[PDB]
Scaffold this active site. Structure first.
Site, short mmCIF file in Angstrom:
data_model
loop_
_atom_site.label_atom_id
_atom_site.label_comp_id
_atom_site.label_asym_id
_atom_site.label_seq_id
_atom_site.Cartn_x
_atom_site.Cartn_y
_atom_site.Cartn_z
CG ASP A 123 15.11 25.41 105.26
OD1 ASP A 123 15.50 25.18 106.47
OD2 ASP A 123 15.80 25.49 104.20
CG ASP A 174 14.19 30.23 94.55
OD1 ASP A 174 14.41 30.43 93.35
OD2 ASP A 174 15.09 29.93 95.36
CG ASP A 210 23.27 21.42 92.13
OD1 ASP A 210 22.51 22.36 91.85
OD2 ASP A 210 23.58 21.13 93.31
CG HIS A 239 23.88 25.10 93.69
ND1 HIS A 239 22.74 24.36 93.92
CD2 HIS A 239 23.73 26.20 94.43
CE1 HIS A 239 21.93 24.98 94.77
NE2 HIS A 239 22.53 26.10 95.05
CD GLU A 291 17.20 31.81 97.36
OE1 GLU A 291 17.74 31.44 96.34
OE2 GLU A 291 16.49 31.07 98.07
O1 LIG Z 1 17.60 27.41 101.41
C1 LIG Z 1 18.32 26.83 100.29
C2 LIG Z 1 18.30 27.78 99.10
O2 LIG Z 1 16.89 28.11 98.93
C3 LIG Z 1 19.02 27.22 97.86
O3 LIG Z 1 18.25 26.12 97.12
C4 LIG Z 1 19.21 28.57 97.05
O4 LIG Z 1 17.98 28.94 96.37
C5 LIG Z 1 20.22 28.28 95.96
O5 LIG Z 1 21.42 28.13 96.66
C6 LIG Z 1 20.34 29.46 95.04
O6 LIG Z 1 19.58 29.35 93.86
MG LIG Z 2 15.89 29.08 97.12
#
Ligand SMILES: OC[C@@H](O)[C@@H](O)[C@H](O)[C@@H](O)CO
Ligand SMILES: [Mg+2]
Ligand SMILES: OC[C@@H](O)[C@@H](O)[C@H](O)[C@@H](O)CO
Ligand SMILES: OC[C@@H](O)[C@@H](O)[C@H](O)[C@@H](O)CO
Ligand SMILES: OC[C@@H](O)[C@@H](O)[C@H](O)[C@@H](O)CO
Ligand SMILES: [Mg+2]
Ligand SMILES: [Mg+2]
Ligand SMILES: [Mg+2]
EC number: 5.3.1.5
Lengths: 393, 393, 393, 393
Positions: free
Chosen positions: B253, B243, B55, B52, B179
């Site tokens: 989750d 994912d 990150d 991200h 997503e």
């Molecule tokens: O529920 C959290 C989500 O799964 C996060 O890890 C997304 O995948 C990321 O923000 C995009 O890649």
């Molecule tokens: Mg994800």
């Protein structure tokens, strides 16, 4: 509150006709004569009636039997004034449909299923129905290796496009509404939610005449927000019909009276149906159809009571939802929370991506900690909606 | 089983970097240096890393800080050979994003959010990523009157089409993957399932470059069949990224290691990824990305162990799934059950609707009770798959 | 409706004091000073405040600091008149409690947790609390082989029985209340529902002073009926305290305001707490405690709005539940449905099993088909409750 | 793996005999003669058969007819050697039980239900059953005001205590086992989970001979951990019988073959039934009963395939669970994770609460931050179990 035919409350023959057998017990009520159902519903204020081909005409009915039944039902319709806005096909009760109709793994069965639908379109067309619903209840699997999932969607598509091509060819004034359900009677059902039905329509040759028939409890069996799902259907202009009932959680499909499940969600569904979107947009205009089952504990007085409770619930919610949006305090709370602000486009008129990245105020010089201080006051807006639902406001 | 870079196992920096804070406790692990993550993952056999923007680059990072961090991370990538196939944006942790990024009710915040994405596309493009993921985690509501649901979808669309137009304009070789997630952190999230994401893409001006990034546990939080959902995405040719993780039921989750949740569903997902559809069709070809979190009970030995368990689980499932379809007994069981029969079109070549209704064999003279006698033997096919998963076959 | 201290509404310091960190973001609000919390709660009409040891006294605080904090805290209580009816211990936030307090696999963490609890009992007694709550938030597992399930129950019992014997030994006028939660933050929490908590208490040596503290949202995370669950605790006379809030479905614990979740179920909960049972029996007379969290999208105005809202919701429901039961049409509907008939014993005074067997009219001569015709009229009875809830009756 | 009678696999007559009617369709298979059922079960290696009174003897049967049926049934048992270890009563299919048996609102239905039960106890004793199961399938409600919840529990207790006193009075060597179910066919069933059933038994007068009959799919309909639930029943020594099957998630009760639902959870269930607890304790030694239904898409070959499959699955899991616990790498992994450490008492022999308080190294002098660094290594431990499950270790 008294429903009038102007309300457009429709009922299936199978709802008040549901006799009471479930997975652990037999029927608790005698069968309902279709002529009686029609008279009874017209006396409560219904606008229309809907049926599955086999709700009315037995599977094994001779020609003479079919004509008789149709003469009796058309007489009843003429006597009472009820409309028949929707007709659907039963592709789930006979043992032949144990693996599906359209997506059965047996090809001869797929052919019968589609033949059975095509004949039913004719009937639908002759009854004056505007909507033809497809609920693929046996379309799915209990186990993951039972199906070629790509082939199952091809087979579904073949059947739906064939039915739609036929409508167009015959010049019938009918639209097809697909009805999603996540599970029951199959372990997993194909096109399980409103999103999956909408996605599927876009891959269809004849999708212009294909839309959705969402049911309240079906969406709630996956734990989704019924109001958010019908809002996505509306926004794509695919909300062709609606099935209203109640559900108390993720479990078997209860088919309770509308409003007898999640009450606040029922309140917001009525607001969306009646008030539309706060900043404007499409409005749903068809029948308010109740697909429910009178609890098997109750006798026939309870059946008519339950039919009446559906329309009363809807009318009571409607009264509260119109009161709610007309309240000046609610209008002020909406503005404060940014409900109308969501309606302004994010970019300025003729502002491109490059122009925005480049605006210093929007990014490099944006004060994120200062923006984050806004009290959206969603809790207060929620409190005001509930006080209006409880009639204390 | 030993993963090689040829396997295409990718990991986010936030997965092995997840420090352990949850709703009722603080971090149990020290932060992970990004340079270390990269070296460590390359030693386990990863192919790539994903991140991200925040990150890697702190939200409040000065220019000098950003350059430093990027020099360190690019050095690490050069030293180890890891690819960066996907880059995503954080539109959920800062307090400014409390009501969303793209669908925040505050317009100034929507503008910052989109500006923040546009800048991240540039970065993504410079890292050589093929996929740009959008996970709208704060896009939703706790309460039904907080949003104009039609306006929320317009606002989402505006942001996604602006980002896509910019890609096209800049000539970048990137596709956007949306997503879905049903809930958490919001009470209800917009575009909650694979079906809702696919539906939404069809209303987009630039949908040709927009597809999906489904996550195993997200679909299972609504109780859906992950394998059926990715099969619908595949069939519409929209499965751009995936994912993989585990989930043990409808609840928060968990982000467990892949295969540490529903095992049989994990088995059938691997079969679909590796073997494709039994009658043929598209095949998924991108990274096998693991979006999971090492349980907070475990120290750093457990972190590397958990990373390794992801690739081992996948490789073990793959071995069993290839063995399963190669078994002659399984091939015979498949034929018996009608798996290949589902692949034959229902109608004959140039057979119309009218032609079918008219075929006596298909309808009027069809023997429904005789057709209903077929033993589909789905249980036996299910038993054979499980014995192959347990390695007893 | 204006709450007053006689209403016995109590709030946790951590409810209004929850700053907003969730799994995907940081706090959105500034820390709340507890002296301010006391003054503000008292102005709104609360009767008391509850807290976790570490809510008031930092985990690291020196004795000097603990004395300092407690003197200002007791001064504020004295200034306002708020009681402190329940005290609890934090055995979940510090990294040391990552595998549990009482059931941690590490023996030295188990001893530390129990000593933390015992010291907290001394403070509980000193504050005048009547109830000491235990929520075993980290007692559980993500994986099934992480624990010996029988040893975990032995360690839970050792911990609760040591604390209970210590109360008894010091002669404190305190009762322990266990609080069940199905999951979150552990994948599976031990004693997941009201039933498991009740069952567990019957194996304790000091069971007499141990009861439950059911929480609305926690039973709704397992899809259970909260009124049925608390009814069973009350029937057994183990309902020692209660936590009220809202949950919209099976998902992460939302902790909304009471009434902002399942409204109809909140109505019937209020009926049982206020009115009791239709035929008579036990009644709950403790405090009405709100264990919720103000949504992170709202500022401090929303925080006090939200605390007000809990009290409003309970008094609105209380009002409609009194009107409902007082209604002569409802009383006759209850009579028709057999609500009072369920209160009569099945057997006649002095009738034995042998006698009943042997009574030909109850079996051999029973007309089961006649008996099955009864209309229980449950649908009508439910329609009456909702019309009272909606304020139309 | 070939089951043999020493394995103690028992099957209900209604499992293989389930013809396929579900809520949306009629039976797909012909009725199974029970003499045939006995011969077929015995050929496959079952040890015993169980039945509901009305599974064998029609509700309407005359005494002549009851004698006739029972003589052929006892002859078949004699011919094959099958035992009849458990007997149960149908208090759910006939329309008369639409509001319950023991808790029906109608007093005359309650008397009829109890007399039906008492007569059935006499047959149970006559067949040599050691266990009498009670599933209160219709005990519950759809609506919260349908029942006085305290009277319902009094009527449930009256019914179970009358039956228990009658066993005791006649000196039958029988135990009663209650079977919890959260819902289906009632919207909410009383005693919904293992915990509620256990709690309820502690309020009975004849509690000593009353225990539970947990069912895999039933606890999984509330999203509970079945191994944790049966662990608690075993710990209390109330696990008198068990029903094994599969469930894929929270939805309608599927009743799949054991192992065709949550596989990893089935593995750990088998470990607890076969291996018991890591540190020692109680063990379940009763029959391993399969309460499932052969999927309606399959013919009678599928029916016997499916019965075989239950036995195969249990022996495959049993095998892998013995290999797993026998493995020296697993035993060391368990040791690192503290599985044996949980078995040590928290307090030292003779240490009091006062003593612990007062032990400065367990509290005042404890290094909580040092203690928190422990790697419990739960992830690695779980990876070892699955590699044993997948037959790779
Ligand atoms: O529920 C959290 C989500 O799964 C996060 O890890 C997304 O995948 C990321 O923000 C995009 O890649
Ligand atoms: Mg994800
Ligand atoms: O779950 C049953 C389903 O809701 C059924 O009543 C469909 O609506 C009908 O088959 C089409 O109208
Ligand atoms: O899930 C949180 C839990 O409800 C908590 O706030 C307990 O109630 C408190 O620890 C005991 O009072
Ligand atoms: O949900 C059905 C239930 O599991 C039933 O088959 C009981 O087990 C049987 O009535 C008692 O043995
Ligand atoms: Mg419907
Ligand atoms: Mg609580
Ligand atoms: Mg059972």
């Amino acid at each position: 509150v008294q429903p009038t035919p102007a309300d457009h409350f429709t009922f299936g023959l199978w709802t008040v006709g549901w006799t009471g057998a479930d997975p652990f017990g037999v029927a608790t009520r005698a069968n309902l004569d279709p002529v009686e159902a029609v008279h009874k519903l017209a006396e409560l204020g219904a606008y229309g009636i809907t049926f599955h081909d086999n709700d009315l005409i037995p599977f094994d009915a001779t020609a003479a039997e079919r004509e008789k039944i149709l003469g009796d039902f058309n007489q009843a319709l003429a006597d009472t004034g009820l409309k028949v806005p929707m007709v659907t096909t039963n592709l789930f009760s006979h043992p032949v449909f144990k693996d599906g109709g359209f997506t059965s793994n047996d090809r001869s069965i797929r052919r019968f299923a589609l033949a059975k639908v095509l004949h039913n379109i004719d009937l639908a067309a002759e009854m004056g129905a505007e909507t033809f619903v497809m609920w693929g209840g046996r379309e799915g699997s209990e186990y993951d290796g039972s199906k070629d999932l790509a082939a199952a969607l091809d087979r579904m598509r073949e059947g739906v496009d064939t039915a739609a091509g036929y409508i167009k060819d015959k010049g019938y004034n009918l639209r097809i509404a697909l009805e999603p359900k996540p599970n029951e009677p199959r372990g997993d059902i194909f096109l399980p939610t409103v999103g999956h039905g909408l996605a599927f329509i876009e891959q269809l040759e004849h999708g212009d005449i294909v839309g959705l028939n969402p049911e309240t409890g079906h969406e709630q069996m996956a734990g989704l927000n019924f109001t958010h799902g019908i809002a996505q259907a509306l926004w794509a202009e695919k909300l062709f019909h609606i099935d209203l009932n109640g559900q108390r959680g993720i479990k078997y499909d209860q088919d309770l009276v509308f409003g007898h499940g999640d009450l606040t969600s029922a309140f917001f569904t009525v607001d969306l149906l009646e008030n539309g979107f706060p900043n404007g947009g499409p409005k749903y205009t068809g029948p308010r159809h109740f697909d429910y089952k009178p609890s098997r504990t109750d006798g026939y007085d309870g059946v008519w009571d339950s039919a009446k409770a559906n329309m009363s619930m809807y009318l009571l919610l409607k009264e509260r939802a119109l009161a709610f949006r007309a309240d000046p305090e609610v209008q002020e709370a909406m503005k404060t929370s940014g409900v109308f602000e969501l309606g302004e486009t994010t970019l300025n008129a003729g502002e491109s991506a490059a122009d925005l990245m480049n605006d210093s105020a929007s990014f490099a010089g944006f004060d994120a900690e200062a923006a984050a201080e806004r009290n959206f006051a969603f809790i207060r807006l929620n409190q005001l909606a509930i006080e209006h639902l409880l009639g204390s406001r």
